[model samples]
Target: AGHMYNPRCKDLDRDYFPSYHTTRFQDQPEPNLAVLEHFVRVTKQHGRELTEKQGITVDHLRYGEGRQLVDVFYSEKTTNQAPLFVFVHGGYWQEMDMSMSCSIVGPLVRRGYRVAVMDYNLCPQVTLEQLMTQFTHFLNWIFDYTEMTKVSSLTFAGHSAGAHLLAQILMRPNVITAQRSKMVWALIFLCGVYDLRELSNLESVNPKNILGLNERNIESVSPMLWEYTDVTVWNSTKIYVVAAEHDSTTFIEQSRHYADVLRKKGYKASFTLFKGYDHFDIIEETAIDDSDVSRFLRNIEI
Candidate 1:
């Protein structure tokens, strides 16, 4: 919030970095505990209202203490054989909870898919490397549990940092395999931060926290460096990369670059721009509108 830039300033990737640290608001120190507590409170409020109106039930998954838990907003609509959509909550990789994304359950369940919102430990409290490992555990857990329940198809969706993490979970299609991989059918990334290398130069992100000065460490947590050798397993699963019209220039470039790489590698991936939209707005588009978002989900056969 230091200084605002054109949402689509094409030069964001090339410009804006160490030299511009003084211009971003999130880059500045804020009340971390307050913000996180508010996240929990706001989400509970919204989730309660949403569930009551839609007949949705809330289920909790306890993995570990201090952010290891995840929430699942599901309705027993499927015959235990329906597709499951796992949602990742995004907060620049260091904040928020799954409840914030509960609104997503409405549209997904309306389309006959089971919705599971996942939560992960935040940064500073946990390093990116550790966070990635926890996600590997959570996703594998979902894969195994969903199958044991005989859920048919699997799809993954997330926003911002959540989207980036989902990319890593599905990068290798084995997660969608028959026995080991849980048959992920499609991936929907909304305004996800796909490339972390871009953050090294951004002021809003703690360069050391988002990524270490060491190239090897950065590569460890950055999805952009991962290969798609395992992608061959779920070759037919389509990927939808959606970019926000008014997102930060840094985020827009991240999506563009990742989409280009995926396309060049022959992945079933494509990018779509939701005009007049920003990072936060897409939540509404996917949950409340039920117009364009509903159409998009319906079009996907997964």
Candidate 2:
């Protein structure tokens, strides 16, 4: 049982507050589950629409021994020097796939950028350690493959668990080389949790189900516990750690603290909070024009 006044215990006690850390608990106009259902539906619909849509051309690239496939979207206008915008969707390493990640592809490709959406192995079937290992190899392969294809720059963005994976991939030692790190121009991390310790303990999150994150190995995969040893990458990359207004306090705080940790440690990290948006909708709104996220994305120096 959780005390009514206790926020900490309330998250773990599902019966105490059913949607404490989720979209259902936010001020969104739609029903809780529908918000996500709509997002999943809309993004996947857009992904299919991408095929028949003119001007955009997609190339499927396989990684992880052909088990994982990434969709790279580009247009006729894309140049040799055009920057690649890579997005990793967030599903807490449980749900959603690269298909639900193409919402911003058309917009980005139309803007003369190549957009790549990566699909990775999920948890429960594979442990957190295995997932991270695959990400490390994926990063290496992507960088090498891009260089071979003459790509000059890349802006990496991730939502939710994808952002967490990005941080771990960057911070983990020896995953990306000094030369390859220079290709990383910027990173936009939206509504991601850096620490997994508290999340591992939350019944609402239920890391045990999808992530198989037990107490002994929780610290191993958390970005908060790892050292950002690649100082060169930090010096060259601009990192935006952003959160939505309706993001739970824990996620918002994790972004704040991680940004602060980066800034204080001499990393170029900034934080933003989007008003009038929730976690899922923030990314969905990226497909639409004039949204706060859309404006922010438009304003980025590609």
Candidate 3:
């Protein structure tokens, strides 16, 4: 019952338009649903291909000294060793596994980039704070265990919940960088949830109960609220935020809002919205051969 002229309704309400902000999940349009379905299929297929691809290796590294463990995907491409891209997969911190992202490894590898797709324990069983701490350990392991020849530079990329976690990892300092804020050279954020507090309004949010039910975690999960320090981790990083043109309103807003924060902090922040793409398709498009996304990824320096 949404109005054709209205462009911003929260659900299928008769008064508003189907906007990223207002449209409910079930009320999503046909094209968006189609895009979502195709994306799911590709991810599923890639996950199954893991057993077939022998180049990529999975390392179960300790999350901390003696506490928890996380899986990290590390592999050197057949072409060359460029920047080490630490890719985080999207699962809302609750659903899915790093193995599910087996498909994501090809594009970067084909482009001659070393990749590390990370896996951390989910929330409730593992709070967002705990996962963040685990990232510090993972990075430390890479710094200590990885040789300089394995990485020309360090980059971070994430999708959905993974994107947010990637941001959290780059924003903090590690033993290698010693709390040095500008450690990473670039960041690729794909359809990530920037402010968890904003999404809690949905009926599906589980952290709503654990995060104390408000916008409080928005500051914690979102780099937007962090203070500017000469030591601020993002000061020297190039940040790219991509949003699907047809995504729900909150995600688009999250992209714009994060860009605004980056600009205010004097960091280079770029935002792009892909046409003919929904939430899921964005990731898949980046993986295809001769894709517009491939051209874009080609231009990225390390």
Candidate 4:
């Protein structure tokens, strides 16, 4: 694949480029389609098993019509003080579902935390604006439910495109910041893409006509391209930007760069690159005994 060069990023953002030559998600020279498919199969199997398993409660709720659903996982026995950990999956905003994203919910539940997985319609099916708007509704819905149910401190975790959505909410927090910003405890960005312009030249991605990616709307959507309007709104909130060691250079660099950007603005931010992990497995194994997620859960009271 040939690297496509558009106008370089503004002088400050130029260093991170020239952007990805091979837009394929994998770091390998060739895309590992089989392993990715295997991941989908195994995780879905784990997902179904989780819904039917005992020891935790599963409440499926819909916020609106057409794929505006959330699968709330929790321990009915625990008190409402348990922080709600909301997770949204990263399928490039075009794939995955709540059902297939509970791989770590049980672990969190067992650790005395409540969990929820958000789901929405994929791109090409729903416009990107709708998807962004849809997530804000989930934030408000989460806030309302938490208040009604007495769950206060909230932590948000997202992978890849899911993390991108989280960025939009924080950087453009019309409803969330004004009302529920204090309620937000921490934000975990795992293998996220902060600069959508980096993907502008990727022949593989936008060529599929997915994400409505183009010159017109690319800058508007990319958080890295966002102006530093006000970072003080999240003075108490902690931001964690994490990338897998085995992941693509583009993702790792984005995490590092975003964390730097966050710190430059005086936001409580940190970056972590977990050793010996890949993009998919880094998230899938989040529940296993001493994984980074487990350690993170151990460290954070909220």
Could you give the C-alpha RMSD of every candidate to the true structure, in order shown?
Answer: 5.8, 3.5, 5.4, 5.0
Candidate 3 C-alpha lDDT tens digits along 91-163: 6777666656655666666666666766776766667767666766676666554454555567777888878
Ranking by lDDT: 2, 4, 1, 3
Q: What are the clash counts of all predictions, listed in order?
A: 10, 0, 7, 0
Question: If scored against the real structure, what TM-score would every candidate get?
Answer: 0.80, 0.88, 0.76, 0.85
Judging by TM-score against the true structure, name the best candidate: 2
Q: In terms of TM-score, how similar is model 2 to the real structure?
A: 0.88
* Clashing pairs in model 1, backbone N/Cα/C closer than 3 A: 1-24, 1-25, 2-23, 2-24, 2-25, 3-23, 175-181, 175-182, 176-183, 176-184
Ranking 1 against 3 by lDDT, winner: 1
Model 4: weakest 10-residue lDDT segment is 13-22
What TM-score would candidate 4 get against the native? 0.85
lDDT of 4 at 13: 30
Q: Give me the runs in candidate 2 sitting further than 4 Å from their true place.
A: 1-9, 13-30, 207-210
Per-residue lDDT for 1-302 in model 2, tens only? Answer: 43322345534333222123454534655466566667789888888877776557889989876347788888778997788888988888777888889887877777788888999888777777888888888787788778888887888999988898888656655757767777888889998877777656666666445677777888777876665665656588888999887766666677888788777777788989888677887888777767778879878764
Find the number of clashing residue pairs for candidate 2: 0
> Considering every candidate listed, which one attains the maximal lDDT?
2
Q: How well does model 3 score by local distance difference test?
A: 0.61
Model 2: which ten-residue window has the lowest total lDDT? Answer: 12-21
Error of 2 at 283 (Å): 0.8
